[PDB]
């Protein structure tokens, strides 16, 4: 029993970390048979970050304009023989394949899904964690200066799936990066000048997850008969900053084991977010909308 | 910026996982040069578990009595060629050195102290998390049936320190282990029976640590002018279910950094324990105690002007 934030272990892509150095920008790079992905903003001389010209920096380089080095492990540089860019990354090709490269997909998250994060300085592993795609595609992560090229993925069944490579801090504690397409989380732009973020919410899904875990943990006190309907919850949560509540398997699942249906936790849902009046559940005050259904399953059963 | 519970990468610690195997008992094993180490209770049958006599289950094993093999990575079947008992462990000699045996030392951590926890299952490394060693000698971590054997460690300058090997679960969500001598953390016994846990405590020079992230992360409405000494603080915490604050480095550079005063901190946590008045800490409404100093100063300190 117990619920906490939990992360896929970190070794196959530890394996795959590298360094990358263009001019005098440095960063990290995910290496990966015979290609090695990074930023593309690595190419910006440091000055000239607010609005760059990506294609006129890219015609400005060759081969020999890129450094690889293999930090961690059987220390190695690599020798860059071609280079393209995919979106916000740049796709150099190396000419030895990677020989730790694990089985891996290549997929983008959806606003509500969990994947863990293997941040990165110097093309060295430093820390893992877990984020949520926010309902703004945005993360909530924790990163400073050297970490762009940080590696956001998940693991099932042997395979590895790469989500996310880290590009830029948004605001305060706010982050976001790409898919390996190159595709921006959030069609945020790789330059430093101010874009909007939009309003974020609570996804209620995980919070149900949630309520559904606390209940395994024995905590139950906020489960009433009260009911609520699912289309009369997504008429409250679409005025509420709640995302619309949509049935899965897993939740299901939960409903099943616990004999606590849907529509009393999104009853209890409107009851605590209007407050949760001196009480606690798992510690917390305040629903916590970061595990998923799946998430939850893992903790109480296989 | 932004602060979350972040754990040491796990990878150098994932090669040492193997599946230690003894009658139809199996559970995870830590392979470090020629030794592996394991919960002595995987020599119990499955339904003698009240109160196993050890001493007596240690002397009906010989080496062959004991399975270990590797799955996962660059795998392997060792021989063992030796065994003893230490403490709440099983110690065994095999014949192969782990050749990814990390640089490494054992280290039995205080009160106080965070560590990152890999979970395992039949020889699987399945998650990673960290935890606080409670004022009681306990964690709040996640496990289930299978998952003793599973290891905590720390990293620092390229050395693992290995700090916690699972051995059980003593009521919900709260679970315990062993140091790698074979020292059950909050002296708990082996055996299923009920055994009472001392009170918990908030660890106040981490809820200190963790407001002075909240002030680095731009959330600075509960620090005032408002001081409280620290014998003053000491004082109010023996009643109040608080550890004592001891001055550190760590949060003498946070406090230089910020600009706001230990006292200042003390203080806020004072009128925090009484309440938060609708408002909130870096998205939280309770205090938060599992951030060590040394935590916070990994994931907000920066450059110092001297
Ligand atoms: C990674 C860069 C790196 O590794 O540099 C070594 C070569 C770094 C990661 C962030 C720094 C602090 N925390 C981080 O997660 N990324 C950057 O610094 C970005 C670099 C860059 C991006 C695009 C073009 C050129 C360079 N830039 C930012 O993250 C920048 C940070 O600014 C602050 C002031 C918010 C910290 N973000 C930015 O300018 O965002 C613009 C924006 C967009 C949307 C909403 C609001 C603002
Ligand atoms: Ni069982
Ligand atoms: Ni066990």
Known sequence: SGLVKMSAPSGAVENCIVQV?????????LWLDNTVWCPRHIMCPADQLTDPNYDALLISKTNHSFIVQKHIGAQANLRVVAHSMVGV????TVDVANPSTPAYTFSTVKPGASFSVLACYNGK???????NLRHNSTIKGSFLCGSCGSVGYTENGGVINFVYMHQMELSNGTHTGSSFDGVMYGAFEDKQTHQLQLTDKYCTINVVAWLYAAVLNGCKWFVKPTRVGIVTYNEWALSNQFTEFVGTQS????????????????????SLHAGFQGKTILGQ?????????????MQVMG
Do not use: W
Request: glycine fraction near 8%.
């Open 21 to 29: 150095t263009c001019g005098s920008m440095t960063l990290n790079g």
């Open 89 to 92: 990354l740049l796709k150099l």
């Open 125 to 131: 592993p430093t820390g893992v964690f877990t984020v």
């Open 251 to 270: 939740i299901d699942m939960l409903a099943h084991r616990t004999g606590v249906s849907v529509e009393q936790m999104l009853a209890a849902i409107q």
């Open 285 to 297: 005050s305040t629903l916590e909308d970061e595990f998923t259904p799946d998430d939850v399953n």
